[PDB]
């Protein structure tokens, strides 16, 4: 439905069949050997759990070093009650024989679940030798419904008709009925309500269909519908409500919360946004609660982990963020003791994800914390499914932790080797796959750590059929870069064969792999040129370069790369020669591909190799492509630009054909394509210059000049751009639309509202008012000023950026007083306008003639009673000193009294901004000898120390830090002594924060400045050294 039309462009599902189980998720020392017989026995009593026992004994190999922490980790895994019992008994038998020489419940529920699936599946196994609709029990029914409902009976005659219903559903499905309306003081307005409730959501917020007070917990739940003000409503509501919940963290406690979210973060109908926000609540409260979340942790991940598997990137990165925040937030042994049972969970999905979880928790708590656990898993002998997982875990660890895997590399591998030989396949498969990923983070290093891995791998390579095969390649390929090209030499020479025979497969997983390999195998220094030229190329260009490939995304890239590196070796003309002929193949994405490839290649290798005839085929090509562009895309454009700037004056015979098209296109074809050709000029300016084709510069100058009346923004933008780059080649006084014509012609454009205009314009105006700037009579400028001024409404940074820098350039052209007087026009009555960038004008201006001029105007202008412009002038000083530096050694005096006034209150803001002035001054002056005053100011600063107001404080920290370098510590420290021990908390909080900041820098200086301190009974606090007198 049309509402199903415009509402579906609201949000959208995005998900596969596969990912939709999500709906199904219901919420939450040889006697060390014979010892292992003991441990196994006792725990087995307290059945069969494996990787537990292995996390136990997995503290062996550090021998002598195992401790209390055993009771910690194990303490969670088993019921912390039995904990003490066991690990105590152990520590005893270990010290001695060292001489004489709900969780459990949970897993129970799992083994339950699969025992059940066995019963049913077997029931249709002998029944086939003979789901959601599965009937229900009253014990089960009560649990699903919340609290607070009666079951009924209407009657055994009533419930008898019910019992009769089905039999009479067919029976009375076929019988008589139809329904008849009759033509003929109401009440009861239902309350459906408070920003708004979608229809579906009633189910959640139903209790806001009741209107009462005086119920107490239920007043906390009924107050937590603050959510709805999160989920729906106005942005400001969302904001304020959001904090109100944050500070209510500690209070309501997690339990009620997550009880009241996870339904919503599970909502079958949830949005994008609503999702993302409700994540925001989960993070934010998770900045607070720490010990608290424990019972909830699994009861969180179950929602979150699916986040890991999302099309949206930004989705993922949020997810990871919070799974750390949880995992670190909770305890390690929490995380573990939590998350075993998902390992063997029947669904491959939940495993898969469960891994990526462990990846994250591992990034949090470090590998080596977690190793003995893993290493336990991969030695689990119950079933493989685990091992399939545990290995996967290794991988996603690899991917995430990446370059940092390096140190425990050896251990990790020492896990994973025992897979490769396994009887089950996948486990082989995934395993090797991991080795790959490892190496891809191990670049380049740790070669011999992988070492004992190979010799199977190579052999494995031989005998295989299938996905696994190419996987082993995925590894080896990522190895080779890590070898010694003598050893690597040999081994390489073996592979490039199988690689050959395997180009041809239909598998795409394959072609990705073998591709990336070639990048590496023949991507080598120790491989010989011709050999590639013969065996590989002709296949390569044969089977790969095909239209299957480029339509897909990855393959596109990976391809480009590969071909590029074959260039970096066998040369340029070889490749480019073979793919030129395909610019003129029709379909775009393909063309786009050849085009970018070439672009790079003549990027790296250089044009210089290319012959002639081939070259004709280039430019003929690169036009023929460029003439037909589905969208406007950077690709062909850049690809071209590089083409030319590489060819240099080899290019020259070809212009007329270019600029011919450049114009022809330029016109017609209706305006959409125009901007493109415009840019094309932008980039090829330089080439039109040095070769000295000036008739061309007549052409461009003037004919562009005409378009500047073009009304579409997206043309005019690119137009100017072209003009700018045209200016950077031909100087001012040779400009064929001599500036006098031009610069005004621009001038009125500045209204243009639309973006790209304002950008390229102000850019242009800038270049020209910098460089020539004499060409144009002053009057015109001052018009420009009074037009600039409101470019400072720009939503964008860059505009204001160059805007300011221009403001300066002209301010040079004319001279200052006016231009600040004119800038001085911004006032306190408004604000957003003259917010600051204007001030930045006051600054830059104040440099570009001697500021030593301008102050008195400025200073005096702090008199004005209008508050916000007052503070404005303060910042003016701020940026001002930041931009002047040494020179401050003078006007310092001028400001100092003013800083005294402003620094004394009117309001915070005075103190904030002013204080900043103190900063940049205090650095700039450094060590010219003007301290005295700065000391003086330090006073009026000082009291400000105390406040909660974040901007005021981080301001002040700014101040005292700089002031430290100016005054030196010793003086500072003489403000910070008394504070340290002051009885109160408040003061000690701060004076410590200061004394730290003093302390880190210049720690070396201090020694002198700790005062003498009298030694007490147990101790000597007097440092006797210094008083040794010769």
């Amino acid at each position: 439905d049309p509402f199903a039309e415009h509402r579906p462009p609201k949000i959208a599902d995005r998900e596969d069949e596969y990912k939709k189980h999500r709906r199904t998720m219901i919420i939450s020392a040889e006697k060390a050997k014979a010892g292992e017989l003991k441990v196994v026995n006792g725990a087995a009593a307290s059945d069969q759990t494996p990787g537990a026992t292995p996390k136990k004994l997995s503290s062996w190999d550090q021998a002598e070093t195992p401790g209390h922490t055993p009771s910690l980790r194990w303490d969670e895994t088993p019921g912390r009650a039995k904990g003490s019992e066991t690990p105590g008994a152990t520590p005893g038998s270990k010290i001695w024989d060292p001489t004489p020489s709900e969780r459990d419940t949970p897993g129970h529920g799992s083994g339950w679940a699969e025992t059940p699936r066995t019963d049913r599946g077997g029931d249709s196994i002998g029944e086939t030798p003979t789901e959601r609709n599965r009937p229900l029990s009253d014990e089960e029914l009560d649990a699903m419904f919340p609290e607070g409902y009666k079951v009924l009976p209407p009657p055994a005659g009533y419930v008898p008709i019910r019992t009769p219903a089905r039999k009479l559903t067919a029976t009375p499905t076929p019988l008589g009925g139809m329904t008849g309306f009759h033509m003929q003081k109401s009440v009861n307005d239902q309350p459906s309500g408070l920003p708004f409730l979608k229809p579906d959501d009633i189910q959640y917020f139903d209790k806001l269909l009741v209107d009462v007070d005086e119920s107490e917990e239920q007043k906390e739940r009924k107050i937590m519908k603050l959510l709805l003000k999160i989920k729906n409503g106005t942005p400001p509501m969302r904001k304020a409500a959001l904090r109100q919940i944050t500070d209510k963290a500690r209070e309501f406690g997690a339990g009620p919360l997550f009880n009241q979210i996870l339904p919503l973060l599970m909502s079958p109908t949830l949005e994008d946004q609503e999702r993302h926000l409700l994540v925001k609540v989960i993070d934010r409260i998770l900045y607070k609660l720490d010990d608290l979340v424990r019972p909830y942790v699994h009861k969180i991940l179950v929602v979150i982990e699916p986040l890991l598997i999302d099309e949206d990137y930004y989705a993922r990165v949020e997810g990871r963020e919070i799974i750390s925040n949880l995992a670190k937030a909770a305890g390690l042994a929490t995380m573990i003791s939590t998350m075993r049972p998902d390992i063997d969970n029947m669904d491959e999905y939940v495993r898969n994800t469960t891994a990526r979880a462990f990846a994250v928790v591992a990034s949090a708590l470090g590998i080596p914390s977690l190793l003995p656990f893993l290493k336990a898993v991969c030695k689990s002998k119950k079933s493989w499914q685990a091992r399939h997982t545990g290995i996967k875990i290794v991988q996603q660890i690899a991917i995430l932790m990446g370059c940092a895997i390096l140190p425990h590399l050896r251990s990790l591998v020492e896990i994973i080797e025992h897979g490769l030989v396994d009887e089950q396949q996948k486990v082989r498969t995934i395993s090797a796959l991991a080795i790959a990923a490892l190496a891809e983070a191990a670049t380049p290093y740790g070669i011999e750590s992988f070492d004992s891995v190979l010799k199977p791998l190579w052999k494995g390579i031989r005998q295989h059929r299938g996905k696994g095969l190419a996987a082993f390649l995925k590894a080896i390929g990522y190895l080779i870069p890590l070898m010694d090209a003598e050893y690597a030499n040999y081994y390489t020479r073996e592979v490039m064969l199988i690689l050959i025979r395997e180009f041809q497969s239909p598998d795409e997983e394959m072609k990705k792999i073998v591709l990336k390999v070639v990048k590496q195998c023949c991507g080598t220094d120790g491989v010989e040129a011709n050999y590639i030229k013969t065996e590989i190329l002709p296949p390569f260009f044969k089977h790969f370069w095909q239209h299957r490939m480029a339509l897909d995304r990855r393959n596109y890239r990976q391809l480009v790369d590969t071909t590029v590196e074959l260039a970096n070796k066998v040369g340029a003309a070889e490749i480019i020669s073979r793919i030129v002929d395909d610019l003129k193949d029709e379909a775009e994405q393909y063309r786009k591909m050849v085009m970018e490839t070439i672009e790079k290649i003549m990027g790296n290798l250089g044009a210089a190799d290319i012959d002639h005839k081939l070259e004709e085929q280039l430019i003929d090509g690169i036009l023929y492509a460029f003439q037909e562009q589905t969208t406007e895309d950077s690709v062909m454009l850049n690809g071209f630009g590089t083409v030319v700037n590489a060819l240099g004056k080899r290019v020259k015979p070809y212009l007329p054909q270019i600029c011919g098209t450049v114009l022809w296109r330029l016109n017609n074809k209706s305006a959409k394509v125009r901007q493109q050709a415009a840019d094309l000029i932008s980039r090829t300016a330089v080439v039109m210059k040095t070769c000295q084709e000036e008739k061309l510069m007549g052409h461009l100058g003037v004919v562009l000049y005409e378009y500047l009346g073009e009304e579409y923004p997206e043309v005019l933008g690119s137009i100017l751009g072209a003009l700018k780059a045209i200016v950077n080649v031909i100087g001012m006084h040779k400009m064929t639309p001599p500036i006098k014509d031009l610069l005004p012609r621009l001038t009125p454009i500045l209204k243009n509202r639309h973006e790209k205009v304002q950008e390229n314009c102000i850019d242009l105006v800038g270049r020209i008012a910098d460089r020539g700037a004499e060409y144009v009579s002053a009057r015109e400028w001052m018009r420009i000023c009074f037009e600039l001024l409101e470019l400072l409404k720009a939503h964008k940074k860059a505009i204001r950026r160059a805007t300011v820098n221009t403001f300066g350039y002209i301010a040079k052209a004319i001279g200052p007083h006016d231009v600040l007087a004119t800038l001085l026009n911004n006032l306190k009555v408004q604000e957003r306008q003259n917010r600051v960038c204007t001030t930045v004008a006051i600054a830059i201006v104040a440099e570009t003639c001697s500021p030593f001029t301008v102050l008195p105007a400025l200073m005096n202008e702090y008199r004005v009673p209008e508050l916000n412009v007052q503070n404005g002038v303060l910042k003016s000083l701020s940026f001002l000193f930041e931009y002047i530096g040494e020179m401050g050694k003078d006007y310092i005096y001028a400001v100092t009294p003013l800083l005294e006034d402003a620094l004394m209150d009117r309001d915070l803001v005075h103190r904030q901004t002013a204080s900043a002035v103190v900063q940049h001054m205090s650095l700039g002056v450094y060590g010219f000898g003007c301290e005295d005053s700065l000391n003086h100011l330090l006073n009026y600063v000082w009291p400000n120390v105390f406040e909660t107001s974040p901007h005021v404080i981080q301001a002040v920290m700014g101040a005292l830090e700089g002031l430290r370098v100016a005054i030196g510590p010793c003086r500072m420290l003489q403000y910070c002594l008394q504070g340290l021990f002051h009885p109160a908390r408040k003061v000690r909080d701060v004076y410590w924060k200061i004394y730290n900041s003093i302390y880190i820098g210049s720690q070396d200086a201090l020694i002198a400045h700790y005062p003498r301190i009298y030694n007490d009974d147990k101790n000597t606090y007097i440092r006797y050294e210094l008083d040794y007198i010769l």
């Binding site: 406040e947 009885p983 005062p1011």
Partner: protein
């Protein structure tokens, strides 16, 4: 005793009411007196948050 905490200090006057509130009077005394350092400013315990 804020009494006899007052005969150990050259300038024992520097002891003030909240002072023997000190976790470490036995020190704070010997510092706060110290040669050139500057007193902590007075605005807290006045709950009016620095200016009116």
């Amino acid at each position: 005793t804020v009494a006899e905490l007052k005969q150990l200090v050259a300038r024992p006057d520097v002891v003030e009411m909240h002072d023997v509130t000190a976790q470490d009077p036995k020190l704070l005394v010997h510092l706060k007196a110290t040669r050139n350092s500057v007193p902590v400013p007075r605005h807290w315990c006045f709950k009016r948050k620095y200016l009116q």
